[PDB]
């Protein structure tokens, strides 16, 4: 059942409570509910997405940025970055799977294998993840010639059709620059290669969000309770520091209600809101909690530390012919290439967007167009590390999000981004793109030196919208990892975290499907 008025829920005790109906949370809640003897509550601050066209129709996604569907988290002033940048985060069932571009990737095996081998996360490797990617998806590429693929899972992945002529020409241009066409999600990492994406979208244009995929089919299940429009303000603990449930409100100034869990509570509020909720509940860096008058239940210094992202630059071009006016999601191609020899993962990625992306260039006076395209390089393994911290002890105050972009001491992130702008220019300049590439609008051909491109990047960079890593898993004995390898919050019992917070190291690719995989694995670790 769907509860949209908490005042009518009389029995508020469940076996499991999942907090946050996002990419991971929806998956955890649905998988736990597959046992009819187990009762599960899924609590989400935003509305139900059922029948909401702006959310459901993927090609409308860019309209959700800074809408009522967006928590809208501006960042703290950046030491070496864009202080105007905003971390858009969805406030709606499905979480960011309901506001995103649906770019769908399996993580490289080399990334996942390292979670265990390098970062102490016992049991987290490609052997554990491959069957879960299979289980979660219905992939267009499924079949005996690609037996790793799922053909039955809730999350539908399809290939973006090569309809966009500028896209086709860009791929031809990649080939000329020595970047071959490569299939994505084959099980083998693409180090040097490019193509139209796979996207998690259904045939009819509906995003295959975690809510559409996992939740809509089960809303009437007898053992499943969906609670929307309800915002968690604190986790509640014993006595013996067992998490017994969660305090929620239906409106900022209203009565506090509580839901209780007999077995466990799973926190899935994502990489920004998770560390915030833990800190408000007394789990976090002791000095920071004390500063805000919060009783320290667990001194957990890794909470809100190790914030990682894929920082993003932009190169914008006027197009010499009419650009496409229809799309799956306006960002249909990805390009991977290594900037150095010896790599088993690309250190650089670029997206191609069939629109001019002027979000951060217009304010700095760069020219605009209504007929143009963008190439957006990102750093796949940024070395910079930031924080999420409390602004105050009041749950209604937005957290302080400081990614510390381009602050890594060896200057890796900036070096790769500069290479990325140069590589974007190189691809755009190939013969196959001669009939497309017009004037470069930003940074503009006048920007040529390392220094000029660095200044431009600092002023105008965005994000691919991939904050991760703020409540990382790690070795039981590592004090700076708030979670053990089974996602259990250290220092407390009955509480796990499952969402993008958990990643010890960012993945090379767009993380959404991997975060769904994290939810699948959390369900399994529990059951
Ligand atoms: C937002 C966004 C995200 C992404 C992209 C663009 C944009 C604008 N681009 C690409 C994408 O399309 N594919 C991809 O692989 N990566 C991109 N994408 C990032 C992913 O979408 C993102 O990493 C995952 O969605 C993260 O999932 P996770 O489960 O970690 O978090 P999510 O935000 O989905 O769910 C959290 C839910 O929790 C609710 N919430 C938050 N705070 C509370 C409180 N206090 N009480 C109750 N619920 C609460 C949020 O409303 C979310 O539903």
Quick description:
By secondary structure, the chain is an alpha/beta fold. It is built from eleven helices and 25 strands.
Describe this entry's structure for a reader.
InterPro entries: FAD/NAD-bd_sf, GMC_OxRdtase, GMC_OxRdtase_N, GMC_OxRtase_C. By secondary structure, the chain is an alpha/beta fold. The protein has four domains: 1-46 and 210-309 and 385-402 and 467-527, FAD/NAD(P)-binding domain, CATH 3.50.50; 47-104 and 197-209, Glucose Oxidase, domain 2; 105-161, Arc Repressor Mutant (Orthogonal Bundle); 162-196 and 310-384 and 403-466, 2-Layer Sandwich (Cholesterol Oxidase, domain 2). The chain has eleven helices and 25 strands. A hairpin with a 5-residue loop joins strand 11 (231-237) and strand 12. The longest helix has 17 residues, at 412-428. The chain is globular and about 70 Å long. Bound molecules: ligand FAO. Ligand FAO binds at residues 19-25, 43-46, 88-91, 95-97, 99-103, 231-232, 268-271, 273, 277, 464-466, 499-500, 510-512, 515.
Question: CATH class of the largest domain, please?
Answer: Alpha Beta
Q: Count helical runs.
A: 11
- Tell me what the CATH architecture of the largest domain is: 3-Layer(bba) Sandwich
Report the major sheet: 8 strands, mixed
As a percent range, the share of helical residues equals: 10-25%
Which ions and ligands are bound to the chains? ligand FAO
CATH fold call of the largest domain: FAD/NAD(P)-binding domain
Q: CATH homologous superfamily of the largest domain?
A: FAD/NAD(P)-binding domain
Distance between the termini: 23 Å
Radius of gyration, whole Å: 22 Å
Silhouette: globular
Helical/strand content category: alpha/beta
- Content of β-strand: 15-25%
Structure summary, number of beta strands: 25
Q: How many domains make up the coordinates?
A: 4
Subunit structure: Homodimer.
GO molecular function: choline:oxygen 1-oxidoreductase activity; flavin adenine dinucleotide binding
Organism: Arthrobacter globiformis
Pfam families: GMC_oxred_C, GMC_oxred_N
């Amino acid at each position: 059942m769907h509860i949209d008025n908490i005042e009518n829920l009389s029995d508020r005790e469940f076996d499991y409570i999942v907090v946050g109906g996002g990419s991971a949370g929806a998956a955890v809640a649905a998988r736990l509910s597959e046992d009819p003897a187990v009762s599960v509550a899924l609590v989400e601050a935003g509305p139900d997405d059922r029948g909401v066209p702006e959310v459901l129709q993927l090609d409308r996604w860019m309209e959700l940025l800074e809408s009522g569907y967006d928590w809208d988290y501006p960042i703290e002033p950046q030491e070496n970055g864009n202080s105007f940048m905003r971390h858009a985060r969805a406030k709606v069932m499905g979480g960011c799977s309901s506001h995103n571009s649906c770019i769908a990737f399996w993580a490289p095996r080399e990334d996942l294998d390292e979670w265990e081998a390098k970062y102490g996360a016992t049991g987290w490797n490609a052997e554990a993840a491959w069957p879960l990617y299979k289980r979660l998806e219905t992939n267009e590429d499924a079949g005996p010639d690609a037996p790793h693929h799922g053909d039955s899972g809730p999350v539908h992945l399809m290939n973006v059709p090569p309809k966009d002529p500028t896209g086709v020409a860009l791929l031809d241009a990649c080939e000329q620059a020595g970047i071959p066409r490569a299939k994505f999600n084959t099980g083998t990492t693409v180090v040097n290669g490019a193509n139209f994406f796979q996207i998690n979208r259904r045939a009819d244009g509906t995003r295959s969000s975690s809510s559409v995929s996992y939740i809509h089919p089960i809303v009437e299940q007898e053992n499943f309770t969906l609670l929307t429009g309800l915002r968690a303000r604190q986790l509640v603990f014993d006595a013996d520091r067992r998490c017994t449930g969660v305090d929620i409100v239906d409106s900022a100034f209203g009565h506090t209600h509580r839901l209780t869990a007999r077995n466990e509570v799973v926190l899935s509020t994502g990489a920004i809101d998770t560390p915030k909720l833990l800190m408000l509940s007394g789990i976090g860096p002791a000095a920071h909690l004390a500063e805000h008058g919060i009783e320290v239940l667990v001194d957990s210094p890794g909470v809100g530390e190790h914030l990682q992202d894929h920082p993003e630059g932009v190169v914008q071009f006027e197009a010499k012919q009419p650009m496409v006016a229809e799309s799956t999601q306006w960002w249909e191609i990805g390009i991977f290439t290594p900037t150095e020899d010896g790599l088993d993962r690309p250190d650089l990625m670029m997206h191609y967007g069939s629109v001019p992306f002027d979000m951060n260039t217009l304010r700095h006076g760069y020219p605009t167009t209504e007929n143009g395209f963008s190439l957006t390089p990102n750093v796949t393994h940024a070395r910079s590390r930031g924080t999420v911290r409390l602004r105050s002890r009041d749950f209604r105050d937005k957290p302080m999000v400081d990614p510390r972009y381009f602050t890594d001491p060896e200057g890796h992130d900036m070096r790769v981004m500069v290479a990325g702008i140069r590589k974007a220019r190189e691809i755009a300049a190939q013969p196959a793109m001669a009939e497309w590439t017009g004037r470069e609008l930003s940074p503009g051909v006048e920007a040529q030196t390392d220094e000029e491109l660095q200044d431009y990047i600092r002023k105008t960079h965005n994000t691919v919208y991939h904050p991760v890593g703020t409540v990382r898993m790690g070795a039981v004995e590592d004090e700076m990892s708030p979670l053990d390898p089974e996602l259990r919050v250290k220092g407390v019992t009955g509480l796990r975290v499952a969402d993008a917070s958990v990643m010890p190291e960012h993945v090379t690719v767009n993380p959404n499907i991997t975060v769904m995989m994290i939810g699948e694995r959390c369900a399994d670790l529990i059951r």
